[PDB]
């Protein structure tokens, strides 16, 4: 019997929690990119460096999309939905994006 107010609180909570995981993963990969840049060789020809940057971009795009959706939800915008409902690229982020997609399909 979830009220509209409960549905809305669930949406905000889940978007916030996913953002925290996304942001934590970016801090991890960024520290890793910085150490790699400092410690590795031939970083002109290191595909790993570009792929990490691309991955970080995917995570940060999602953080922004989720922030804007939270903002719309708080503004009472009808049928606010995250622009991105897939996970980037056992893994908790992937389970939570599936739940996110389901929440915005059923409510």
């Amino acid at each position: 019997l979830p009220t509209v107010d409960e549905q809305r609180q669930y949406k905000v909570q889940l978007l916030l929690h996913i953002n925290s995981i996304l942001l934590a993963r970016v801090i991890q990969m960024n520290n890793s990119l910085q150490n790699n840049l400092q410690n590795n060789i031939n970083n002109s020809n290191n595909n790993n460096i570009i792929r990490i940057q691309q991955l970080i971009s995917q995570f940060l795009k999602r953080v922004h999309a989720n922030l804007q959706c939270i903002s719309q939800i708080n503004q009472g915008v009808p049928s606010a939905k995250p622009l991105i409902l897939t996970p980037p690229q056992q893994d908790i982020l992937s389970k939570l994006y599936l739940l996110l997609a389901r929440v915005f399909e059923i409510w």
Binding site: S20, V26, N30, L60, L67
Partner: peptide
């Protein structure tokens, strides 16, 4: 929310 917005900016 403000921690996340700030972190996104800083990032």
């Amino acid at each position: 929310l403000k921690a996340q917005i700030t972190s996104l900016k800083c990032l």
